[PDB]
Write an enzyme that holds these catalytic residues in place. Structure first.
Site, PDB file in Angstrom:
ATOM      1  N   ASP A   5      47.002   8.312 -26.382  1.00 40.02           N
ATOM      2  CA  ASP A   5      47.016   7.434 -25.193  1.00 40.02           C
ATOM      3  C   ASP A   5      46.281   6.140 -25.556  1.00 40.02           C
ATOM      4  O   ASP A   5      45.540   6.048 -26.573  1.00 40.02           O
ATOM      5  CB  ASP A   5      46.243   8.155 -24.046  1.00 40.02           C
ATOM      6  CG  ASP A   5      46.483   7.548 -22.620  1.00 40.02           C
ATOM      7  OD1 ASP A   5      47.248   6.555 -22.426  1.00 40.02           O
ATOM      8  OD2 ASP A   5      45.869   8.125 -21.657  1.00 40.02           O
TER       9      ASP A   5
ATOM     10  N   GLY B 262      38.847   0.434 -23.058  1.00 38.79           N
ATOM     11  CA  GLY B 262      38.536  -0.774 -23.790  1.00 38.79           C
ATOM     12  C   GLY B 262      39.773  -1.408 -24.451  1.00 38.79           C
ATOM     13  O   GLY B 262      39.658  -2.478 -24.982  1.00 38.79           O
TER      14      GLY B 262
ATOM     15  N   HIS C 116      41.960  -6.562 -13.981  1.00 36.95           N
ATOM     16  CA  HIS C 116      40.753  -5.753 -13.790  1.00 36.95           C
ATOM     17  C   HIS C 116      39.646  -6.026 -14.841  1.00 36.95           C
ATOM     18  O   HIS C 116      38.474  -5.723 -14.605  1.00 36.95           O
ATOM     19  CB  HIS C 116      41.056  -4.232 -13.675  1.00 36.95           C
ATOM     20  CG  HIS C 116      41.140  -3.527 -15.007  1.00 36.95           C
ATOM     21  ND1 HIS C 116      42.342  -3.167 -15.557  1.00 36.95           N
ATOM     22  CD2 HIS C 116      40.178  -3.028 -15.830  1.00 36.95           C
ATOM     23  CE1 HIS C 116      42.129  -2.536 -16.703  1.00 36.95           C
ATOM     24  NE2 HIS C 116      40.820  -2.421 -16.888  1.00 36.95           N
TER      25      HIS C 116
ATOM     26  N   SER D 112      42.272  -2.040 -22.335  1.00 36.15           N
ATOM     27  CA  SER D 112      42.772  -2.793 -21.177  1.00 36.15           C
ATOM     28  C   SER D 112      43.099  -4.210 -21.495  1.00 36.15           C
ATOM     29  O   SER D 112      42.300  -4.890 -22.123  1.00 36.15           O
ATOM     30  CB  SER D 112      41.742  -2.844 -20.024  1.00 36.15           C
ATOM     31  OG  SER D 112      41.557  -1.508 -19.501  1.00 36.15           O
ATOM     32  N   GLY D 113      44.235  -4.683 -20.972  1.00 37.61           N
ATOM     33  CA  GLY D 113      44.620  -6.116 -21.144  1.00 37.61           C
ATOM     34  C   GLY D 113      45.464  -6.309 -22.376  1.00 37.61           C
ATOM     35  O   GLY D 113      46.166  -7.302 -22.474  1.00 37.61           O
TER      36      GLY D 113
ATOM     37  N   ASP E 286      47.948  -5.731 -11.772  1.00 38.68           N
ATOM     38  CA  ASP E 286      46.876  -5.785 -12.759  1.00 38.68           C
ATOM     39  C   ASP E 286      47.295  -6.730 -13.938  1.00 38.68           C
ATOM     40  O   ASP E 286      47.627  -6.298 -15.062  1.00 38.68           O
ATOM     41  CB  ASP E 286      46.512  -4.386 -13.213  1.00 38.68           C
ATOM     42  CG  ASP E 286      45.196  -4.328 -13.965  1.00 38.68           C
ATOM     43  OD1 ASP E 286      44.462  -5.339 -14.003  1.00 38.68           O
ATOM     44  OD2 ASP E 286      44.818  -3.276 -14.535  1.00 38.68           O
TER      45      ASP E 286
END
Ligand SMILES: *[C@@H]1O[C@H](CO)[C@@H](O)[C@H](O)[C@H]1O
Ligand SMILES: *[C@@H]1O[C@@H](C)[C@@H](O)[C@@H](O)[C@@H]1O
Ligand SMILES: [Ca+2]
Ligand SMILES: [Ca+2]
Ligand SMILES: [Ca+2]
Ligand SMILES: [Ca+2]
Ligand SMILES: [Cl-]
Ligand SMILES: [Cl-]
Ligand SMILES: [Cl-]
Ligand SMILES: [Cl-]
Ligand SMILES: [Mg+2]
Ligand SMILES: [Mg+2]
Ligand SMILES: [Mg+2]
Ligand SMILES: [Rb+]
Ligand SMILES: [Rb+]
Ligand SMILES: [Rb+]
Ligand SMILES: [Rb+]
Ligand SMILES: [Rb+]
Ligand SMILES: [Rb+]
Lengths: 140, 254, 198
Positions: free
Chosen positions: B186, B190, B41, B192-193, B90
C-alpha cells in the site's frame, strides 16, 4: 404406397430414403437406448438450414443450435458485427496513441498532449521538445 | 510505501518532496516547470506559509547531489469545497516561485484530458505510486524514494471487498481505490500528495494523488486516491490565473 | 438504470458469448473483459442486445481466466452501474461440440471408424484449429457401437480421431461417437454424434 411395404424393416429404406417416425425407428433398433440415441439427432433438425451466419461466415450444426465461424473482419453469434465499423474512441482509444476525438458522420481523429505532435500516420505522437512530459530519459 | 521497491534514481523524475521549515511534509507531482499537484490535507497544520519548499530531483534524503533543485512555493491552491480534517476534494495545486529546469532527473508527468483519463486511463489495471513515506504502518519513513505497482478498482468492487469500519469516510466520485486487501502492499501517510501515475502507449500520466486509507496495508482495505480526472478543468483554469499576494488560495470548485 | 443480472457464459468449441438480463428499456450496455492482471477491453459498445460475443478476446489465450462485466448506461448517453460475470477459463469450461462420423471402412475383419476433425474458433495462420489441435492428449473420442442382432453395447476409446474395432463376419453394426476431456470433472463430454450404421 402399400407395395413399398412388403420387405423386412430397413433403416436405409425407411429412415434414410424416407422420413421415419419414432416407432418405425424403434422397430428397427429394438433396444430403448439404441433407439433414443439415433432419434435424438435424427429428429433434431439442421439449425444451419436458415443460413444464420452473415458476412460470408460458416455454420456448423449442433443439437438444437449451431456455431458460426466468421471471416477475420467479423464477429458476433451470427458474424453480424463489422470490426471495420468499430473505430471509436471507447474501443481501445480509437487506436490513438495519446488523445482520441470522435466525429459522428465521419472518422475519429487522434491528437497529442502539449510537447508532442501527431505523426503523418494520424495515430502516433512524437516529442517536439527535449523533455516532453511523461517519458523517463534516464532509461534511454 | 509498504512492500514496494526503491525507485532507481531518475526513474521517478516527476516526484516532488515538499518541506516546511526544512522538514519533510508530503509528496507531490511536477506537471510542468512551474506547477506541482499535491494533496490538500498536507496543508491542514501549516502556520508558516512562506516557508514551504518543493525539491525536484531528490532520491536519497540522506545525501545531497547535483540533481536536486529546490524552489520556494509561491501559492497553494485548494478547492473551497475541501474541509480540513476530512477526505473529500483532497487536492492542492502549487505554483513554484521560479521554474525548475528540466533534466534527465527532473521531468513533469503529463496531466491528461478528462475524457481520455475517464475512458481509457481508468481501465489500465496497474499504475505506480511513490514516495518517502512509512515503510510499515506507523513505522519509520524511507530515506530512498520508494515505488509500488497497484491495481485500480471501480468503487462498487472496492466497497464489496472492503471490511466494514463504523463511521468510515464515504468513497465519493472524487476518489478511487487502488492496491491490495491482503496486508502486503500500500501507500502510507508520508506518501500523501504523491503521484499515482499510469503508463499508456509509451507515455505516463497523472491519474491519482495519494490521499487516505484505513491505516497502511491493512487486511480488508485498499488505498484511496484523489480522482484527478475530476479536476482537469479546475487545474487548467487555475494554471492560467494571476498570482496573488498571500500563499494560500481557496478557489471555487467546480 | 438497472444493473444486469444472471450473467452467463455460453461457450462451445471456444465460440464464447456472454448473456445477461434484462431486456433494455431506456438503457444500453457495454461489456468489458479482462484477465486477472490485464487491462479491461471494451466490447459490444452501447448495444441494446443482451448478449456479447467475446470469442475474439478469449481465443488470444484459451488457458487464461477471464472476468467480464456489463455496464448499464441511461438513454441519451462518475461510475455507471454494473455487474460482474463469473470467472471463465475457456480451456477448462468450453463445451465440446457435437461430433460427426466422417466414414467407416471395413479393412480385413475390422472396421475403421473416422471422426471428422472438430473445428474450433481458435485461429492459426488463416485456418481454424481442430479440437485435437487445441487439446492434444487431453482429448479423446469414445465410440458406442453395437451389433444389431445382439443385446448389450460395446465402447471403444481413442487418442486420435480413428477407431479400429473387431467385428463379427456378415453383421451390421451401428456407431455413435463423443468428444471427451477425461481430466475434467464437470462438462466432460460432448453430446453424442448422430448414429451411423453399415
Ligand atoms: C435460423 O436462422 C435464424 C435467424 O435467421 C436463427 O434464429 C435460428 O436459430 C436458425 O435456425
Ligand atoms: C466456411 O468457413 C468460413 C470462415 C468461410 O471460409 C467460408 O467460405 C466457408 O464455407
Ligand atoms: Ca420409398
Ligand atoms: Ca410398424
Ligand atoms: Ca442439429
Ligand atoms: Ca538527496
Ligand atoms: Cl508551519
Ligand atoms: Cl525559488
Ligand atoms: Cl477516472
Ligand atoms: Cl478434432
Ligand atoms: Mg438407398
Ligand atoms: Mg416403415
Ligand atoms: Mg411397434
Ligand atoms: Rb418411412
Ligand atoms: Rb416404406
Ligand atoms: Rb415397421
Ligand atoms: Rb499537441
Ligand atoms: Rb463509509
Ligand atoms: Rb496495517
Amino acid at each position: 404406397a402399400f407395395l413399398e411395404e412388403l420387405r423386412p424393416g430397413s433403416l436405409e429404406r425407411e429412415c434414410k430414403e424416407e422420413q421415419c417416425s419414432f416407432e418405425e425407428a424403434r422397430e428397427i433398433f429394438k433396444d430403448a437406448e439404441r433407439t433414443k440415441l439415433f432419434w435424438i439427432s435424427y429428429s433434431d433438425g439442421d439449425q444451419c438450414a436458415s443460413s444464420p451466419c452473415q458476412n460470408g461466415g460458416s455454420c456448423k450444426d449442433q443439437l438444437q443450435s449451431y456455431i458460426c465461424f466468421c471471416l477475420p473482419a467479423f464477429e458476433g453469434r451470427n458474424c453480424e458485427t463489422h470490426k471495420d465499423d468499430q473505430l471509436i474512441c471507447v474501443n481501445e482509444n480509437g487506436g490513438c496513441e495519446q488523445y482520441c476525438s470522435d466525429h459522428t458522420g465521419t472518422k475519429r481523429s487522434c491528437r497529442c498532449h502539449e510537447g508532442y505532435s501527431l505523426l503523418a500516420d494520424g495515430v502516433s505522437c512524437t516529442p517536439t521538445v527535449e523533455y516532453p512530459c511523461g517519458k523517463i530519459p534516464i532509461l534511454e | 510505501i509498504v512492500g514496494g521497491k526503491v525507485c532507481p534514481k531518475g526513474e521517478c523524475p516527476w516526484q516532488v518532496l515538499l518541506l516546511v521549515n526544512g522538514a519533510q511534509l508530503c509528496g507531490g507531482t511536477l506537471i510542468n516547470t512551474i506547477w506541482v499537484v499535491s494533496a490538500a490535507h498536507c496543508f491542514d497544520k501549516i502556520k508558516n506559509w512562506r516557508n514551504l519548499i518543493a525539491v525536484l530531483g531528490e532520491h536519497d534524503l540522506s545525501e545531497h547531489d547535483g540533481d536536486e533543485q529546490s524552489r520556494r512555493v509561491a501559492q497553494v491552491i485548494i478547492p473551497s469545497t475541501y474541509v480540513p480534517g476530512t477526505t473529500n476534494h483532497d487536492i492542492a495545486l502549487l505554483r513554484l516561485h521560479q521554474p525548475v529546469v528540466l533534466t534527465d532527473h527532473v521531468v513533469p508527468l503529463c496531466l491528461p484530458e478528462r475524457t481520455f483519463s475517464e475512458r481509457t486511463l481508468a481501465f489500465v489495471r496497474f499504475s505506480l505510486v511513490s514516495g518517502w513515506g512509512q515503510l510499515l504502518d506507523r513505522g519509520a519513513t524511507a530515506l530512498e524514494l520508494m515505488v509500488l505497482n497497484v491495481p485500480r478498482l471501480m468503487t462498487q468492487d472496492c466497497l464489496q471487498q472492503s471490511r466494514k469500519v463504523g463511521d468510515s469516510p464515504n468513497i465519493t466520485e472524487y476518489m478511487f481505490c487502488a492496491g491490495y486487501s491482503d496486508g502486503s502492499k500500500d501507500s502510507c501517510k508520508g506518501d500523501s500528495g504523491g503521484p499515482h501515475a499510469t503508463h499508456y502507449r509509451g507515455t505516463w500520466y497523472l491519474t491519482g494523488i495519494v490521499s487516505w486509507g484505513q491505516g497502511c496495508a491493512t487486511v480488508g482495505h485498499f488505498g484511496v486516491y484523489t480522482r484527478v480526472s475530476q479536476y482537469i478543468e479546475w487545474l487548467q483554469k487555475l494554471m492560467r490565473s494571476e498570482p496573488r499576494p498571500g500563499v494560500l488560495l481557496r478557489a471555487p470548485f467546480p | 438504470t438497472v444493473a444486469a443480472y444472471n450473467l452467463t457464459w455460453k461457450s462451445t468449441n471456444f465460440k464464447t458469448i456472454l448473456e445477461w438480463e434484462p431486456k433494455p428499456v431506456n438503457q444500453v450496455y457495454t461489456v468489458q473483459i479482462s484477465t486477472k492482471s490485464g487491462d479491461w477491453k471494451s466490447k459490444c459498445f452501447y448495444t441494446t442486445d443482451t448478449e456479447c460475443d467475446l470469442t475474439d478476446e478469449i481465443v488470444k489465450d484459451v488457458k487464461q481466466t477471464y472476468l467480464a462485466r456489463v455496464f448499464s448506461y441511461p438513454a441519451g448517453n462518475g461510475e455507471p452501474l454494473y455487474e460482474n460475470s463469473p470467472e471463465f477459463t475457456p480451456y477448462l469450461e468450453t463445451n465440446l461440440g457435437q461430433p460427426t462420423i466422417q466414414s467407416f471402412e471395413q479393412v480385413g475383419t475390422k472396421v475403421n471408424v473416422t471422426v471428422e476433425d472438430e473445428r474450433t474458433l481458435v485461429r492459426r495462420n488463416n485456418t481454424f484449429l481442430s479440437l485435437r489441435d487445441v487439446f492434444g492428449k487431453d482429448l479423446i473420442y469414445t465410440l458406442y457401437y453395437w451389433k444389431s442382432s445382439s443385446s448389450g453395447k460395446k465402447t471403444a476409446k481413442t487418442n486420435t480421431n480413428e477407431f479400429l474395432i473387431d467385428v463379427d463376419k456378415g453383421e451390421n453394426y451401428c456407431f455413435s461417437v463423443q468428444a471427451v476431456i477425461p481430466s475434467r470433472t464437470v462438462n466432460r463430454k460432448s453430446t453424442d454424434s448422430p448414429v451411423e450404421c453399415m
